[PDB]
């Protein structure tokens, strides 16, 4: 039910994004000893690229329908998106935290990359258990619902026969609210760390505009995509295109604000 | 309908909170010319307290059941919740923005003139966004109280079952659109508030600096909003639980915000009242990172 032209346009855009991701990964894995790239924690950024490619793969996985294994498909793509945005937004807050600590606590007077990776791993483990409880307690079982409903609002009586087919959990709002809440608290502390590391250093090493535009875009994208997924599900081309577009714009935007200053500073050196 | 003991304890707690708010209002009006209250923004504290009493009245109206036009009662409780939240979280952000501009514009001459009328204008713009969103919600898709009886014959992967579900809910037809809109606008506002709390993290003493109150309030706001949305959506067979949880969440959030705003002012009011020999008595209030 998906038009081939829309599918091709989306796949080409996501392939261009993935090629840019691979180019960034090669740049940050080759120029490790360069002063500019080493100043911006090159070993942490590999986690960001892995999260970015995971999100792009999930955006691809939104592009297939029509298989009784749709449930596994939706669970894999949603869990992949969750783990991907977790891995994207981990190291940015970690770098901001380390920059704040070396700016503040060094004045009265050192954090290694392993400590920030441990914080990132704890955050991923939280995401893993929060997804495991969802996939174990109530699955995303697809059911064919046929029902007749009588509408009596107190002034008129009418009857409606609805045959609605959808794929959703028994209590989907609990899981979306809890994942929303955990990610929102994370983005709130990220905005706090962005404020703390405000006008502290150069944008190649100071991640303040990057995290702010990423948090704002993540909030607006999540709201818009949840709205267009819940209500206008009878517009499958629109839902697929908007979901893939939101994921592509977000992932590319954060990755570009992370790595464009690095390449700009490397061009002059 | 609702249990009388829970209604009594909720009303008692909200009355105690409202009397606390009126006491803070009396202190702000009385000692407005005290040096540390003047170094805070008492006029903006008036707006914060007005939002606080609006959301306390919202929590009061959450208990009004089996009386009405209940569809209008839902509108008039949620609208005043949203307006009160705007009026509470506006002036704090304005004060933090003034602190950031005062302490990070260290240029000779060119002194910053940010009068209180500018910040009341910013709060008015935020409230204008609030009222246009609420007007669109009440005009396009109003909440209607509808009772529907229905039967559903669902089929699973291998089994067929039939359920006769009859329910009565009073909710919008496009409810999640309005929830996403208003929670999203509030979310952008509170994320910019977290940014301002970060920027002004070590800018002054806790009487003037509002980093901790912004961070605590924003975390409690997200937690309360998520929990109350879930328990309102999925627990209609437990009216006492949802009423108590909503009232307690509103009371806890508003009381912690107002206590965080006003308790250090009351603590440090004495130290800048009688002697006031030099401005060296307020040296931590001129601090910087
Ligand atoms: C770093 C760049 C990444 C940014 C990308 C952010 C965009 C996310 C949009 C994708 C999610 C939309 C999918 C809608 C749910 C769905 O598929 O339906 C199945 C169902 C919801 O069904 P439903 O409600 O959509 O339709 C049924 C309607 N009915 C009335 C019948 C119930 O989902 C669930 O079962 C619950 C599981 C939750 C999955 C976790 C969400 C993943 C989101 C990834 C972003 C994480 C961080 C953002 C959090 C907030 C940030 C502040
Ligand atoms: C400064 C401290 C303030 C603390 C207050 C924070 C707590 C807020 C709890 C709000 C409780 C909502 C009550 C739901 C009533 C209801 O059922 O209406 C029916 C509908 C939804 O119905 P329903 O889903 O709840 O039940 C019917 C179930 N059924 C499946 C059949 C639909 O709600 C709406 O339509 C609301 C439209 C939007 C109005 C916005 C309300 C204002 C919210 C508070 C101000 C914003 C502050 C929070 C933002 C923070 C962001 C993280």
UniProtKB/Swiss-Prot annotation, chain B:
MF GO annotations: G protein-coupled GABA receptor activity
GO cellular component annotations of the record: G protein-coupled receptor heterodimeric complex; plasma membrane
Transmembrane segments: 5-25, 44-64, 73-93, 119-139, 177-197, 212-232, 243-263
Expression across tissues: Ubiquitous expression both in the CNS and in peripheral tissues. Very high expression in fetal brain and testis relative to expression in other tissues.
Swiss-Prot/TrEMBL GO biological process terms: gamma-aminobutyric acid signaling pathway; stereocilium bundle organization
Keywords per UniProt: Cell membrane, Coiled coil, Deafness, G-protein coupled receptor, Glycoprotein, Membrane, Non-syndromic deafness, Receptor, Transducer, Transmembrane, Transmembrane helix
Superkingdom of origin: Eukaryota
The keyword Ribonucleoprotein is assigned to this record: no
Cytoplasmic face of the membrane: 26-43, 94-118, 198-211
Subcellular location: Cell membrane
Family per similarity comment: Belongs to the G-protein coupled receptor 3 family. GABA-B receptor subfamily.
Listed name of the protein: Probable G-protein coupled receptor 156
Species of origin: Homo sapiens
Gene: GPR156
Parent-protein start and end of this portion: 44 to 335 of 814
């Amino acid at each position: 039910s998906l038009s081939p032209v829309l599918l091709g346009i989306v796949w080409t855009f996501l392939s261009c994004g993935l090629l840019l991701i691979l180019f960034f990964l090669a740049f940050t894995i080759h120029c490790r000893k360069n002063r500019i790239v080493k100043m911006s924690s090159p070993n942490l950024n590999i986690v960001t690229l892995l999260g970015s490619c995971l999100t792009y793969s999930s955006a691809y996985l939104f592009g297939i329908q029509d298989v009784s294994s749709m449930e596994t498909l939706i669970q894999t793509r949603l869990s992949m998106l969750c783990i991907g945005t977790s891995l994207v937004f981990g190291p940015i807050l970690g770098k901001s935290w380390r920059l704040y600590k070396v700016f503040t606590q060094r004045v009265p007077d050192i954090i290694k990359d392993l400590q920030l990776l441990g914080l990132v791993a704890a955050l991923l483990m939280a995401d893993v258990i929060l997804l495991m409880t969802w996939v174990l307690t109530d699955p995303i079982q697809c059911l064919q619902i046929l029902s007749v409903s009588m509408t009596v609002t107190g002034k008129d009586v009418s009857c409606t026969s609805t045959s609605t087919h959808f794929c959703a959990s028994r209590y989907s709002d609990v899981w979306i609210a809890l994942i929303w809440g955990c990610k929102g608290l994370l983005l709130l502390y990220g905005a706090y760390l962005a404020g703390l590391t405000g006008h502290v250093s150069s944008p190649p090493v100071n991640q303040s505009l990057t995290i702010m535009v990423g948090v704002n875009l993540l909030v607006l994208a999540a709201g818009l995509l949840f709205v267009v997924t819940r209500y206008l599900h009878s517009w499958p081309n629109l839902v697929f295109g908007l979901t893939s577009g939101g994921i592509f714009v977000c992932t590319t935007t954060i990755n570009c604000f992370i790595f464009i200053p690095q390449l700009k500073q490397w061009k002059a050196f």
